[PDB]
Amino acid sequence: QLEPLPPLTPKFLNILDQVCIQCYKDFSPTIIEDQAREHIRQNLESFIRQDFPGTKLSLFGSSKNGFGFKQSDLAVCMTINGLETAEGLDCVRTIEELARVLRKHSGLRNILPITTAKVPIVKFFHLRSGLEVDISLYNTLALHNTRLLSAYSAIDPRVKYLCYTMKVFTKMCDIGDASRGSLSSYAYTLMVLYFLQQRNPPVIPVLQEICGKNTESVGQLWLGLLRFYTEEFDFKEHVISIRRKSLLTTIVIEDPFDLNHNLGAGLSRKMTNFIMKAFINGRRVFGIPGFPKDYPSKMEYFFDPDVLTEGELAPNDRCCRICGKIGHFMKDCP
Ligand SMILES: [Zn+2]
């Protein structure tokens, strides 16, 4: 059980609002930087068209879902006109050949074809913009997660404010990178939307079953989420599913389209405990009011890593002691 928090003063609550809103303005991309991502797509499409005529490239992921950061990886989906589907298409061979085509591009570095994962991709670094780029073939389920999240973000501005706040919180606690043992940005976003669907009154519906009645400020909702996932939610009798309103029985997070995909499947237990521990601290920092008269930056007070995680690193027992990423032993690392 947790220690109760004192009541919220309208002043401190007004400050929590500004912090949640600033998490969006400070770290979402500008319109010029989004246009720069579009220009990258156009010039890759023309370059690949030389060796794969009919190529069509589309941006998905953080680039288009309305929750991406600056310096987020640019995720590209590749299709070929006349090839309605990838049925029969040898994706590995295509990815490998694509990698060799891109090595002749003067603006790209560290071309890397990866066929390990479920979906093979080509990875490379783009110098003109300092972004990592991932090209995959016919990744339509990814483009559907994007269209779904993009729809929720446009229903209420508080959706984007909160998802960005969550994104800053997890990134600052070092618990928001799936490749290193923790949970992905997508997972933490689903936890946000799910909390908003379950809030009484609801802030967002379940678009997979089909109005502004919730009048709580973003600050109230942010702390509400921290108290929701720290005090009430039963993490192993209920499944975090934005798919529908009714509570689903068996951290478990269900992908709204791939219903066999549990986003928390690869979670250890000292990471699960480390994650929960970060939320309990956030509950304290954001819920318990010298502030504001001796702190030059409010961001640095609320998102202090030495307070949210108590000066401890994220566990990485699974991880290569050289790269720090999961997925391979210490012998086969780049
Ligand atoms: Zn490694």
How far is ligand 1, taken at its centre, from the CA of residue 312, in Å? 22
CA distance 166 to 82: 41
CA distance 44 to 278: 41
| Resolution in units of Å | 2.6
How far is ligand 1, taken at its centre, from the CA of residue 180, in Å? 10
CA distance 60 to 57: 10
Burial 152-183 (b: 16+ CB within 10 A, else e): bbebbebbbbbbbbbbbbbbbbbbbbbebbbb
How far is ligand 1, taken at its centre, from the CA of residue 327, in Å? 8
How far is ligand 1, taken at its centre, from the CA of residue 322, in Å? 5
Give the contacts of 289 (CB within 8 A, at least 6 positions apart): 6, 9, 12
How far is ligand 1, taken at its centre, from the CA of residue 234, in Å? 35
How far is ligand 1, taken at its centre, from the CA of residue 177, in Å? 15
- Please check whether residue 170 is in contact with residue 305, taking contact to mean a CB–CB distance below 8 angstroms: no
Experimental method: X-ray
Burial 189-208 (b: 16+ CB within 10 A, else e): bbbbbbbbbbbeeebbebbe
Can you name the residues that pair with 114 across neighbouring β-strands? 121
Burial 264-291 (b: 16+ CB within 10 A, else e): beebeeebbebbebbbebbbbbbbeeee
- The structure tokens listed for 162 are 């909160």
- The structure tokens listed for 7 are 């009541």
Can you name the residues that pair with 125 across neighbouring β-strands? 109, 132
How far is ligand 1, taken at its centre, from the CA of residue 332, in Å? 7
Dihedral pair phi/psi, residue 55, rounded to 5°: -60, 135
Neighbours of 247 (CB within 10 A): 11
How far is ligand 1, taken at its centre, from the CA of residue 319, in Å? 7
